[model samples]
Target: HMATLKVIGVGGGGNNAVNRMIDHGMNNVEFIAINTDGQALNLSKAESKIQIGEKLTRGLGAGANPEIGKKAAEESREQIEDAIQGADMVFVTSGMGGGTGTGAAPVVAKIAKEMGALTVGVVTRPFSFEGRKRQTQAAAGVEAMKAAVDTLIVIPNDRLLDIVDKSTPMMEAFKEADNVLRQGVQGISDLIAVSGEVNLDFADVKTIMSNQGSALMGIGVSSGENRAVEAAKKAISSPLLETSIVGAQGVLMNITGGESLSLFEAQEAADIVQDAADEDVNMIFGTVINPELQDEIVVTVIATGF
Candidate 1:
């Protein structure tokens, strides 16, 4: 009973992790799937989930019709509020651009905020191949979600360019994105449930909202094995920058890999963490997973304490 977690992965791009969570037997996390594309509905693995029944046509920016977008957004908001009510924490994931995510996600975030929930948004930005219109849509999503969520960990889909080599096939590009997202979700879950460290939980994430007015959440990408952890540290401990955290307390680390660790391996991870947190005064909770589908690591850091 560490903390109760509600999982909501909006749109098609989030299907990979939702299925992974189901496979791992993650309990108490209910996903509210929001999107205009009916295809996404078939991909969700969360036993408890809701799907919007209509397609709200939006402009080029992935559901950009302000009028239609607003209606679609409201539908998303209602579902989100229902999912998170009386829950300790909510982790939202999505890919911005094209149709659903950009238009619907921000509206859902607004619901999380109004309910006084601690919100962390893990979103992937569109690659250049998505074209200028999608790029514009992606940017709009970031702007829209930030206004409502407590902290946002923005992951550029292009960040994976170096991981599997450019020679990889087009069909494989999305696998990389899915890997990154699952890695992030698994990383966070490890900290919250798998690892025994600080007394942090979903309640803790909810509490982070208090300090979030001054804390900052961001993502760092590289093909380096430890890049995710490194990026998380830098974001939390930027000396020259005024971070959003008022009294920074702890963190949550999530990663996806192809191997599991023994106690000896765990000790090695501890040393790496010690070095990573050297300059930053904070407690960390995290986990690593075998994401058979991806190679990139994505991390979400939460800062807060009483």
Candidate 2:
């Protein structure tokens, strides 16, 4: 058992996104889905499901009213607290712009923080076509979430346009964005939960979270003789990362490699990352050996205080 991880989805969109992540398989993590709608909650495949505002919504929903959403979360404080109990790291995922997710996500983050957990918020802002009102609401929600969590990472929904063409279906575009979020979650999870040859100290994770500033995470995988250099380059230039790597003040690197992994390859990977980062950036690294990796290498990066 690694550090206990609890990832809670905080609304309809949150539930949907988290369910997708669960389907993709996140090992050593407990998934909890929270929502005001019974139908939506029932649809989630998470290990645990919590329906808030049952009394307030009468099994319906918040009807896009953030005030009602906020009230509902307040009423279910005890249940929410119980779900996050004993979690070393808590991740609250949501899509802002809607009522329940926008209003209740911050509350959940606040409670987790108060419980002495390292809380991180992952959210997607509204697309441009979602209307100015929704965008405004999403912005406000981001600020509220930022205040409550130790760190916040937001993905703009419009960024999907950069990856997908106009001819792509809406679901496909959304999937692209969701994949980015998945990569981020997986990146952090690898560092916190996996035991490697050179391990990442829990203290190192705490140090990054304590920065209390925005963080950027990315993952890259490659095979062949040049895998180390290739993986490092891909991670630094990953499209999944919206934050720039140039200004990163601190960096945490976790490298997972096959049984044939060599000291020279490890040193090359570190050198590449150091060369890419700013001169002032502080770097800490760890390595994991996996027989299943064969000749492959995977690199996960977390850049903080940008």
Highest TM-score: give the candidate number: 2
- Stretches of model 1 off by over 4 angstroms after superposition: 16-28, 53-67, 169-173, 192-306
State each model's CA lDDT, in order: 0.55, 0.81
| Model 1 lowest lDDT segment of ten | 58-67
List model 1 lDDT by residue over 117-235, tens digit each.
Answer: 56667677777777898788788877787776776656677666655575888547656555544544444455566533234455555544432433344344333555444544543
State, as a TM-score between 0 and 1, how close model 1 is to the true structure: 0.64
**What is the clash tally of candidate 2?**
0
What tens digits encode model 2's per-residue C-alpha lDDT throughout 184-282? 666667666667678886678778765356777777799997999999887777454446566777888988888888889888987887877778777
Candidate 2 TM-score, C-alpha based: 0.90
Instruction: Show model 2 residue runs off by greater than 4 Å.
Output: 259-267
